[PDB]
Structure 1
Amino acid sequence: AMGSMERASLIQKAKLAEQAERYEDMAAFMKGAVEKGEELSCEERNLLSVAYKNVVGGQRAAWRVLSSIEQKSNEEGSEEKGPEVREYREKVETELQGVCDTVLGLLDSHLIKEAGDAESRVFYLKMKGDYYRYLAEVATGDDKKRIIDSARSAYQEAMDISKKEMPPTNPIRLGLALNFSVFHYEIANSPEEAISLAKTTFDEAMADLHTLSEDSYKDSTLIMQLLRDNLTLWT
């Protein structure tokens, strides 16, 4: 439905939707911009990720409230209340899966294959790992292992490039490590790997801070603080 709008007007309207906190609209404008077929700039990649993060984050928070109520309904001595809680948790789960499939489809057609620079390729592979991770949070069937493996493979290819091509303070590298460590802790049942990766990533960034300008140091230390927040929570 965005095929008739100019690329620059979609970008302009995505920024207005972010100011208005209309994240569903922001995501549909950025999806229209990606489907123009040109590569994204750094600013444009961050608009795409902020839009879908916020849409899927609302769906994930609603799914967790519904899954909690359904788990309680399934405890001994709870009354039978019919199929409605499961049906509505399914409805929200299917719309969240559809948003993840939309993002994964943009990455596969054709953002990753045209991304040659480390900043773009690592960013898109982190997004691929993140949206397979959100699929894995709701997966309960025969494909669950393969969805977890798809998240792990995308994060591992992004880690391999980031280690070779970016400094240890780069904010995309740090946020990748942060999210891969949460994948290990919450999805792969590997809390020791999660804690090792967060510790190593924090320590290697600390040793590289002396190379930075004041503004770069603020960007990097913001994400380092997220890694230390998870280490505090997990240890």
Structure 2
Amino acid sequence: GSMGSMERASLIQKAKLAEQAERYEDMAAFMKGAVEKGEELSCEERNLLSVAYKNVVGGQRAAWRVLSSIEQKSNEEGSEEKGPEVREYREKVETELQGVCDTVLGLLDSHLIKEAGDAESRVFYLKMKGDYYRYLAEVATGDDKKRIIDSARSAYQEAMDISKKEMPPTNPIRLGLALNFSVFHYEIANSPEEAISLAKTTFDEAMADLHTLSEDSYKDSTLIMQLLRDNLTLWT
């Protein structure tokens, strides 16, 4: 596509510049171009891909929630019996959000997941597949909603199975996966008890493995453990 004439290394360099400049749409476009070169991504490069699209979709999710809230009030008992504009603009933002998610899912399917054989890469990509199906589920109605939810679940579950076999309980990718799957259970799947159980087991198993870690690894793992605790405090 548009980045087809730019060197892979230049795309990566410019993605890092875009991050520094808080130009996340540019960052995502550079990283999409890098993926489309066809080579596997290094750990650092996977992280750049994730940061770029997390920030793009994050702005869209925040906007969608604002507009959805306004739309719910306007169709409350006796509010602005107004025109189609709120719905139209919410729908515009929704379609753009869905397009970003579809783009990410398309990169994962062509061909990042299939060429990912190491546990770190495969878990990372499967987690990302679950996350972007989850973002689709946040806005979904109509006949395929259940199916979007099951796609998220299936991706997270395959990631979980690999992570438990192949990674220690403090591994940051394993922890972030468990955190996000617990959010899926609580916010998407109407399964708060499963969410709570998963967060607690994850936290406790990580705590028992901290003794194996260096000072730097300890810092990385405990940061994510605190997010598990923060959710448990919200949920219980």
Alignment TM class, shorter chain as reference: over 0.9
Provide the rounded CA distance (Å) in 1 between the counterparts of 2:201 and 2:142: 34
After superposition, give the CA deviation of every residue in 1:72-109 in whole Å (9 maximum; x if it has no partner). 00101112110000000000000000000000000000
Provide the rounded CA distance (Å) in 1 between the counterparts of 2:146 and 2:177: 21
**Percent of pairs identical after alignment?**
100
Q: CA deviation at 1:141?
A: 0.8
Aligned length: 235
Report the equivalent of 2:113.
Answer: 112
Q: CA deviation at 1:123?
A: 0.1
| TM-score normalised according to structure 2 size | 0.99
Report the equivalent of 1:35.
Answer: 36
Q: CA deviation at 1:115?
A: 0.0
Gaps of 5+ in 2: none
**SS where residue 115 of structure 2 aligns?**
coil
Provide the rounded CA distance (Å) in 2 between the counterparts of 1:181 and 1:13: 34
After superposition, give the CA deviation of every residue in 1:7-33 in whole Å (9 maximum; x if it has no partner). 000000000000000000000000000
Provide the rounded CA distance (Å) in 2 between the counterparts of 1:77 and 1:225: 43
Q: CA deviation at 1:48?
A: 0.1
Q: CA deviation at 1:137?
A: 0.1
**SS where residue 36 of structure 1 aligns?**
coil
After superposition, give the CA deviation of every residue in 1:42-87 in whole Å (9 maximum; x if it has no partner). 0000000000000000000000000000000010111211000000
Provide the rounded CA distance (Å) in 2 between the counterparts of 1:194 and 1:204: 16
Q: CA deviation at 1:140?
A: 1.0
Report the equivalent of 2:91.
Answer: 90
After superposition, give the CA deviation of every residue in 1:137-170 in whole Å (9 maximum; x if it has no partner). 0001110000000000000000000000000000
Provide the rounded CA distance (Å) in 1 between the counterparts of 2:79 and 2:208: 54
Provide the rounded CA distance (Å) in 1 between the counterparts of 2:201 and 2:80: 49
Provide the rounded CA distance (Å) in 2 between the counterparts of 1:71 and 1:19: 37
Report the equivalent of 1:179.
Answer: 180
Provide the rounded CA distance (Å) in 1 between the counterparts of 2:159 and 2:169: 13
Provide the rounded CA distance (Å) in 2 between the counterparts of 1:229 and 1:77: 38
Provide the rounded CA distance (Å) in 1 between the counterparts of 2:190 and 2:20: 38
Report the equivalent of 2:200.
Answer: 199
Provide the rounded CA distance (Å) in 1 between the counterparts of 2:225 and 2:18: 29
Provide the rounded CA distance (Å) in 2 between the counterparts of 1:222 and 1:37: 34
Report the equivalent of 2:58.
Answer: 57
Provide the rounded CA distance (Å) in 1 between the counterparts of 2:228 and 2:109: 29
Provide the rounded CA distance (Å) in 2 between the counterparts of 1:39 and 1:213: 29
| TM-score normalised according to structure 1 size | 1.00
After superposition, give the CA deviation of every residue in 1:188-234 in whole Å (9 maximum; x if it has no partner). 00000000000000000000000000000000000000000000000
Cα RMSD (Å):
0.3
Provide the rounded CA distance (Å) in 1 between the counterparts of 2:19 and 2:142: 36
Report the equivalent of 1:134.
Answer: 135
